[PDB]
Amino acid sequence: VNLEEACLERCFPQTQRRFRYALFYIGFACLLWSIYFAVHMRSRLIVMVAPALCFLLVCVGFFLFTFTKLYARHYAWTSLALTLLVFALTLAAQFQVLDTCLSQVGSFSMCIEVLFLLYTVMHLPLYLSLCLGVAYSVLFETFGYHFRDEACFHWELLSRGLLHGCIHAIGVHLFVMSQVRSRSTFLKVGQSIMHGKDLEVEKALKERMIHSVMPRIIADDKMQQIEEVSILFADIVGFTKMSANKSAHALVGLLNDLFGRFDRLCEETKCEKISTLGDCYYCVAGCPEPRADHAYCCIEMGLGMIKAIEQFCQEKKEMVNMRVGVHTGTVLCGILGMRRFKFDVWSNDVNLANLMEQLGVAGKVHISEATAKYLDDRYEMEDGKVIERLGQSVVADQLKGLKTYLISGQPPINQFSLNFLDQELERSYRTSYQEEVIKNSPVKTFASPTFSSLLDVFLSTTVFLTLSTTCFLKYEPPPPAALAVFSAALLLEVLSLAVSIRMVFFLEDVMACTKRLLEWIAGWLPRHCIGAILVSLPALAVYSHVTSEYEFPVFTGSAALIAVVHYCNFCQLSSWMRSSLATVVGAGPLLLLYVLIGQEVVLVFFLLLLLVWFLNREFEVSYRLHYHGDVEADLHRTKIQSMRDQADWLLRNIIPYHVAEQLKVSQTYSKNHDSGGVIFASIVNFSEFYEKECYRVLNELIGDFDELLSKPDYSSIEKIKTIGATYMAASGLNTHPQEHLQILFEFAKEMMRVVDDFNNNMLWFNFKLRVGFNHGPLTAGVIGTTKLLYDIWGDTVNIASRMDTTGVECRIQVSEESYRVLSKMGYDFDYRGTVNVKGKGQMKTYLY
């Protein structure tokens, strides 16, 4: 009931505006009646004209009430007060009159107009309005017969009751339809405002997802050759000891705040964080925006990382340090792949920066000669001394004479033509009924265009029959012309009713051809033609009983009063045509037939016609506005589903399926896997092909790779990320005991096949995709709060990257652990020897 109070509040201007117009009408109606009374009924003026001018003051007093705040709270009470006042005046006028006599037609006009004011343009409860109207109508008819005059003037009583029944039927139907449009619009305009609020709060989710995989500058809208870029790398020394004797939730927790501290420091540094490779944290400075201070901000974050880890060391009581290595130079950045694509930087300089981190000492910033060229005496500078620190190891074989150095610190509706301002909406409005039939939309509410026609046709049928029933009661020889119109109308009436019920219920007797013409009838032009005759069908019965023996007079005018009233029905049609037809088919015929009784009919129809003209205008714009809320409601629904689909897909671009539900429950996710496999696959000979123009072909190969995860057989494999030219993927995150491990090989076995095929279209150059492979315990987890990031790290991942380093062309290097189950199935495998592995000594590694 709380929503109802808001419904009245929003519709309160409509109720207030309508009630004010009623006061203008009744004041104008009483003004004209008194003027006619003061001219042709001069016999008894003060007993009759005084209430008219007195009621003019009543309208003025009621107009004064509208501005008072009491009317705002109690608009319903004021409307009822006018009801009894106008009721008292009209009933007294009927009694008081009976050159000293007034025709019953004038009395009937007062009854019809006041009944229509109460039903339509007053906004009262249905039971109260109906009961008041029937009580008022029953007293009006009873008084007239009781107080009828004999000096001037069975089925007779039933005739008036049928006339009064028609007025209530149209008034009630107009009233219930008026409420339906108001309630339907209020609910659906409110639905629009809730979709609009949800769209803004759901669009921010989409922008957050884009920001989780791309820089802000790139997010404004696919590769670059930006020079003078300082690259950072770091390693959490002692992370292996942290991994042991630690829970998965606690381990990722210590990383989450540690990375966040880096990110907050990065925000002050205003650098860019590309990605975090497990415990490593590598970032770039100088791209995409051409920053001229790139070398220094890398050192500040590098030295700040040393400070930040120490503060984290004293907060979480951990024994960790930092090993920062920065190398500056040219770099290539962009987006690779169609799924799980992230911003990354690729070059030979980047790999040297990663190596320089491995050559560093904990708590130090290990810079290159290139970075030292951009550094002033603001910072102390030391000899790198890596040659004697680590000896002549394989890792340091490729320094190639580059001296290294270290750092320790420091309402669109026109009033006249009643049309939409936007012609685009106007065209869609006219075709609304046709497409409603075309789509076969089910009947939802009382405001459906197909259902509205059904109720309008039914009302037109009973209005015509009840009105015509009394006409035949007068005669009970009727002229043959009257009989022809009645039978022809009935034949068309039942056919129109049959069409409407079939257009709504859609009986199984329908068939393709009759559905084609049904849509054609729904068009604007042919619906107007059938509606115009149907609306005038009750009116034609009145003037088909008129012949050369007229001089009968009172009843035809009394029946024509209802005929012009019936034109308020069929609200779906244009109000101007219906109102015009009322003037030319409801008032015109009798006006010519009469062409003081002659003055009285002119005044009676003029007052009634203007009420019909205004009521149709008010009810039409209510129906126009209802469809205006319909086009706005459907647009907001399609806007929401557009951004809903966009955001969910970018969720799929960051986290896999199994992480989406858990993230919806808690802000953090973690998992430790007993057994899992990781695959590395790098395009090695790209350096020979590299010389931005070459990388575009590389993008297609990555795009071709992305289609493999779209294959139905690789649904158990979800790639982690693409780094360098390498392709990293894992099998077993979503989990034969090692069925996942086979398909990871099966995914791998398809990896070089497409590489060989992709080389067919190129000219005298073939790409080679060396692959590393090993399986074991691995740890996943989501990193970041405002920027999500998914990664898997551990000893299993690190050696696979090592096997990617120590690999050969198109061969799947396999460690001991996979061999304990891979050769058991039947895979054909070979031997190569042993390679260096950190943390396990020399390792027995084979090939496919």
From Swiss-Prot:
Its EC number is 4.6.1.1. Residues 42-44, 144-156, 474-480 are extracellular. Keywords: ATP-binding, cAMP biosynthesis, Cell membrane, Glycoprotein, Lyase, Magnesium, Manganese, Membrane, Metal-binding, Nucleotide-binding, Phosphoprotein, Repeat, Transmembrane, Transmembrane helix. One of its GO terms (molecular function) is metal ion binding. It comes from the Eukaryota. ATP binds at residues 235-240, 277-279, 323, 721, 791-793, 798-802, 838. Mg(2+) 2 binds at residues 235-236, 279. Changing residue 438 to M: Found in 37.5% of the Asian population, in 30% of the Caucasian population and in 16.3% of the African-American population; reduced adenylyl cyclase activity in response to stimulation of the beta-adregnergic receptor by Mn(2+) agonists isoproteronol and NaF; increased albuterol-stimulated adenylyl cyclase activity in the presence of corticosteroid. This is Adenylate cyclase type 9. The lineage of its organism: Eukaryota, Metazoa, Chordata, Craniata, Vertebrata. The gene is ADCY9. The chain holds residues 98 to 1242 of 1353 of the full protein.
